[PDB]
Structures are given as structure tokens and as C-alpha cells.
Design a protein around this ligand. Structure first.
Ligand code: NAP
Ligand code: GUN
Lengths: 259, 254
């Protein structure tokens, strides 16, 4: 019914990081960018307000925020009066920061900030148009074995074919992913097979991006690497994890066709 | 599970129209436009394909399609191999038309068709920025009693404050010619959908029939655009005189 920060449920980043054989000292930096498409509350006189929230959670935070719990938390604003949009911003930053364990950035944007904003696609070369046969759908990181044997390049690749399954109901998540790197040129077929092999994998979006980054790192050994995925929303919220050897945030945050 | 048209759930439109007490002949025409943001399947060689679908269901169809069922039906494509994009489009038309009871149109578009496409707002004047107090969110059609007493005008009004109890969210565009409508009454009435249950198509038909009966405009269009639930959205359009909106461009929350 009313505003309730206890609805937020953290999940520690360490669970999956330990599974990736990472140390406490991360091989990447970055953030999880969230879009809150249904943020709504009442003003001081009870008249509903609507906005889109843009949130960034540092990748160094102890916890990620579980997405269903984030949805239920936001729903608790819907019948609650707040003094001003600034109060809503302040409450979001306080609660989300406490749950994540590190200061989170929050922008609460009016809907008119999006009028005539264009849908974007990703940068560089799309690798999806390949005339190849897929014979099974089991996850296989060894699809990247020997995948980076070309000359030294800097380039940006992307795919729209990322899909994994949510941990419990096997309901699908959908994403596009952009991979920018400097290192030995990557075999496009290997990279595309590797990404397609997530199609029945169960992991959070943040975990998926970390696994792609660490698997490219270990098998392809680029000198620099950035992996940025943009997923379609679930429960009115989307996640867009960014992980980079050198960059701390993406220099653009614009929605894709399916988002 | 793979392709399964039995997952689709039709709901007779008469089920909820009965409670509107309509004449024998429908007082509106129009359509329900759906956007399918998560449409994906496998090609013949097993490589995933992704697309966005656009569906228009005539408001005269015997049935609407229940949204959860529509989502589960579309998910059944995800691990199914199809020979071509044209086959996918063809089966969508066939299955959704059989469900609705009337021919539906379906476009299956590659993601590239959306690059640079705009996010849009609605036409006319937004009525949401009022200095009024609302405290009682109960549904109350009587809020429209005597709402249209102004001189004869043509105008278009919109609100982003539709919410219909998990919550669903929409914006709604009302174009009319008739006695000028009191914007406070209209906003209170729309906000009163808040706590209250009905399908999105049902809310648009209730808004149309209530405006028709309380305000008596000579002509009227009511068009709502709801945010997606489960990867697809619905955009019901009802009018005394027009058949459809001019495009299906998405709004900021969609
Ligand atoms: C996040 O937030 C999600 C929201 O779940 P929930 O508790 O709202 O419901 P739920 O019954 O737990 O929802 C499961 C899935 O089916 C979708 N869905 C539920 N009712 C639907 C309907 N009437 N029409 C079309 N799709 C429908 C939901 O879409 P939505 O995700 O858009 O609610 C979600 O994708 C959770 O599943 C969690 O992973
Ligand atoms: N943060 C987060 N929470 C989830 N809950 C279900 N899936 C996810 C996910 O990918 N990320």
C-alpha cells in the first residue's frame, strides 16, 4: 500500500564472481544502468505524477538489486504522496544506495524529456547475419577457444541474439550486446556461437555480462575490452550492465528498438 | 515448449460490453493495435531471429485476445524453427485471426526498421497539470455529470495518468466536437480508474460510452496507449467516425 523500502532485496555480486574465479580485485570496472519506465507516485495534493527513472549502480557495489523486488518497491510509491519530485529523487537515491551498498545515481525525468528522442542501434559491425547451423543450445565457453588469432585490431562488434532464462520460471530475457576491444582480431562465427549458447543458461543480466567479459578475457586475451548489454525490460524495469577494462560508464544511454 | 496455438485465449467482447448497456449496433468503430517487442524464433538452421511485430485487431471481432495468453503463445515461437520470415508472419495472421474471429493484420519488422524512429507524445493539450486535490480514487462515472457545458468546440485533450489495477499504465487521447469539457471533471474521472479492474480495451470502451452519455459530443475518439506487460502492449482506439490512428509510434513509457 504505502512506500516501503523493506521490499528491496539485495543479491551479493560475490555469488557469481566466485563462480567466475574472480578475486576481490576485479578485472573490470563499470556499472549497471537501469531504466524505470513506470515510476509513479502522488504529489502533495494526491494527483498522480509519472516519470522515467534512470539509475546507475556501480559495479563495485557489494550487491545488485533483485529486479522483482525493485519493481515491488517502486509500486509502493504509487499511492504515496511525496512533497516534490526532488523528494522522490532523494528517497530513491537513499534506498537504492543502502540496498546496493554504494552510492547510486538517480535521475527522475519527466516524460516530455523523451519527446522526439530517436531509437538507436548499437555501434560497429552486427555479427548476426551468418549462414551457420546451430546443433545444440547448451552453454559452452570453449566455443571461444582459439577465437582470437587474427591481426591486432581495434573494433566494435554487436549482436541482438542474446537470450538467457530467468533463474526460476525459465521465462526468457532478451538482450543486445556490444563488444569493443583492442587485441587479436576475433573470429565472428565463434563469438556468435558463444553468445547463442547462452539461450538456455540461467543467470542474472549482470552475471551474464561479467561472464562474457571474463570468458573473452581468458580465451581471447584482448589488451582492452568493453562489454555493454542492453536488455528488454521485465516488470517495467530494464538493466543494461556495462563492464570495461578501462571505462567506468558508457558515453551514451539511449534505448534500443526492443527496449 | 515449442509452437502451440492452443495457448491463445479468446475473450468474447460481449462479456464486458454487456455491462456498458450498448445499443444493438455498436456506437463506435476502431481497433486494438498491439506491439510485440519480443518476437523471436529460430531459422531453418537453428539460428535465432528477432523482430518486432505490429498487430491490428478490428474492434468488431467477436473476441479479444487475453494478453498473458498472447505472450505465452509468442514465447512458443522462441525455440521453434521456421523456414522463413514470411512463414512466421503468415502463421501469426492465421492464428490470431482464428482467435479473434475476424481477420487481423500483422507486420513483422526487422529491428533495423526502428533505427531513428521517434518516441512521440499525444495530440492536443495535456490536462494533467492541474492544481486540484484528489484523495478518493474510487471509480465514479458520475464525475462526468454536467461536465460538458462549454460552447461548441473541437479539441483534443490527453492525460498520462491512466492506471488500472499488479498495476497497468497508460496515456489516453480524447478528440471531440461538442460542448467544451470541464478538464477538472475529466481528469478526476480518468484518475478514478486507478483502483478498479477491467481489460485495457474495456477501459477505453467505458471512457467512450461514458463521455458519449454524459457529454453528448457530435463526434468522439478515445485512444489509449498502454505500457507493455510481458513484452507486448495494447493500444485500443475507439471512435464515432475514425477507423484507426495514423501510426503506431511508441510513447515515452512504452
Ligand atoms: C520482474 O518483474 C516481473 C513481474 O512479474 P509480476 O509479479 O508482475 O507477474 P507474474 O505473474 O509473476 O509475471 C510473469 C511474466 O508474465 C508477464 N505477465 C503477467 N501478467 C500478464 C498479462 N496479464 N499480460 C501479459 N503479460 C503478463 C509478466 O510481464 P511483466 O514482466 O511486464 O509484469 C512477466 O513477464 C517478475 O516476473 C520479475 O522477474
Ligand atoms: N538484478 C537482477 N534481478 C533479477 N531478477 C531476475 N532476473 C534478474 C536479473 O537479471 N538481474
Amino acid at each position: 500500500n504505502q512506500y516501503d523500502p523493506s521490499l528491496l532485496q539485495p543479491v551479493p555480486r560475490s555469488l557469481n564472481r566466485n563462480d567466475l574465479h574472480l578475486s576481490a580485485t576485479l578485472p573490470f570496472q563499470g556499472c549497471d544502468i537501469w531504466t524505470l519506465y513506470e515510476l509513479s507516485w502522488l504529489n502533495q495534493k494526491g494527483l498522480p505524477q509519472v516519470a522515467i527513472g534512470e539509475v546507475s549502480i556501480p559495479a563495485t557495489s557489494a550487491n545488485l538489486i533483485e529486479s522483482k523486488s525493485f519493481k515491488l518497491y517502486l509500486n509502493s510509491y504509487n499511492q504515496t504522496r511525496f512533497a516534490s519530485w526532488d523528494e522522490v529523487q532523494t528517497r530513491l537515491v537513499h534506498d537504492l544506495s543502502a540496498c546496493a551498498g554504494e552510492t547510486v545515481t538517480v535521475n527522475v525525468k519527466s516524460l516530455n524529456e523523451y519527446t522526439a528522442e530517436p531509437i538507436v542501434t548499437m555501434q560497429g559491425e552486427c555479427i548476426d547475419d551468418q549462414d551457420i547451423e546451430i546443433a545444440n543450445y547448451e552453454f559452452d565457453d570453449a566455443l571461444l577457444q582459439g577465437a582470437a588469432q587474427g591481426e591486432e585490431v581495434s573494433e566494435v562488434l554487436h549482436s541482438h541474439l542474446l537470450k538467457s532464462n530467468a533463474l526460476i520460471t525459465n521465462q526468457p530475457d532478451w538482450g543486445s550486446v556490444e563488444i569493443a576491444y583492442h587485441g587479436a582480431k576475433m573470429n565472428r562465427e565463434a563469438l556468435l556461437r558463444y553468445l547463442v549458447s547462452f539461450r538456455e543458461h540461467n543467470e542474472f543480466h549482470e552475471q551474464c555480462v561479467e561472464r562474457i567479459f571474463t570468458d573473452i578475457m581468458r580465451y581471447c586475451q584482448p589488451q582492452s575490452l568493453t562489454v555493454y548489454a542492453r536488455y528488454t525490460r521485465r516488470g517495467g524495469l530494464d538493466i543494461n550492465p556495462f563492464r570495461s577494462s578501462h571505462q567506468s560508464a558508457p558515453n551514451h544511454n539511449q534505448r534500443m528498438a526492443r527496449q
